[PDB]
Design a protein around this ligand. Structure first.
Ligand SMILES: O=C(N[C@@H](C(=O)O)c1ccccc1)c1cccc2c1-c1ccccc1C2=O
Length: 291
């Protein structure tokens, strides 16, 4: 269990960013690692087999905006990125979850197109294949996996921001609606901790949110927990050693550098570090330290 870092890839501040930086909770240090080959915001990060994957996003740049169909792999042992097979379609503001060593890419946008489509990547074969689409088109969607079931939470369908959520049952290749959240959330951070799916922050159509709610997969209810110190949309999120970490985002005024940590035992958030610069739209995942 030792030696793991929180990696943050990409993001946005004025333009999309290529940064890969890794935080060590055991000593408070940050490392700057190999830049992404292409800057991207609105991507997602995940880890399979000790390798960090960066999925989708968009390169917002002075010379144009290009939505990304890319899958790229970072190996901490070599500090190098390698391209993988690309997805069927570009997906900005994507959500991603991993089940049994397979990466699911969910929703996202391509220009004015808001996807309901979903595809699954097989690292051993370096292939993507489409699976059943969601019941709702969702961009800015939060995704997490609990008990080998995949959840898609909130987002924007092209007309309205959403409080709805749905679950994918892989052995039936089928999506079903679950109880909706109490709050509309686009661009929330969504993760799994213990028996619950958490949705932290986001934008409700009027304001960035500091509230946080969790869905108990047995009781099918959403319950609010302690709010974050900062309102934030387009935040990064991950879980490490039993605590939720939220990174960056936009608070309605500033691109945040703060990283907050949620302790479920005390139901409290604390500010634990700051990124090297404020940014939104990052991808985040946990794997072994490099070299
Ligand atoms: O929170 C906002 N927007 C969310 C939405 O539209 O649902 C969203 C959700 C997910 C990804 C991107 C955006 C929002 C509202 C007004 C002004 C601004 C933003 C914003 C967000 C991120 C970076 C910069 C800004 C910014 O200047």
């Amino acid at each position: 269990k030792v030696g793991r870092l929180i990696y943050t890839a990409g993001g946005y501040f004025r333009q999309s960013l290529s940064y890969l930086e890794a935080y060590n909770p055991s000593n408070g240090s940050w490392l700057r690692l190999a830049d992404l080959q292409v800057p991207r915001s609105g991507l997602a990060g995940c880890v399979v087999g000790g390798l960090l994957y960066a999925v989708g996003g968009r390169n917002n740049s002075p010379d144009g905006n290009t939505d990304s169909s890319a899958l790229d792999c970072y190996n901490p042992m070599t500090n190098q990125w390698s391209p993988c097979a690309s997805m069927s379609v570009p997906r900005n503001r994507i959500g991603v979850g991993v089940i049994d060593g397979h990466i699911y890419a969910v929703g996202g946008s391509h220009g004015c197109i808001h996807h309901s489509s979903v595809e699954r990547y097989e690292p051993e074969r370096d292939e993507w294949h489409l699976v059943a689409p969601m019941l709702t088109r969702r961009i800015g969607v939060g995704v997490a996996v609990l008990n080998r079931l995949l959840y898609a939470v909130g987002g924007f369908d092209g007309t309205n921001r959403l409080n709805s959520a749905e679950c994918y049952y892989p052995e039936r290749n089928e999506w079903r609606m679950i109880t909706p959240m109490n709050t509309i959330r686009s661009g929330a951070g969504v993760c799994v901790l213990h028996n619950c799916i958490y949705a932290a922050g986001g934008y409700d159509g009027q304001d960035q949110l500091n509230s946080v709610e969790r869905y108990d997969v047995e009781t099918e209810t959403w319950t609010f927990v302690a709010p974050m110190r900062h309102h934030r949309s387009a935040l990064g999120i991950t879980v490490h050693q039993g605590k939720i970490y939220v990174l960056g985002g936009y608070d309605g005024h500033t691109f945040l550098d703060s990283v907050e940590c949620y302790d479920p035992d005390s139901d409290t958030w604390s500010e634990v570090t700051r990124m090297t610069s404020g940014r939104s739209g990052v991808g985040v995942a946990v794997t072994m330290e490099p070299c």
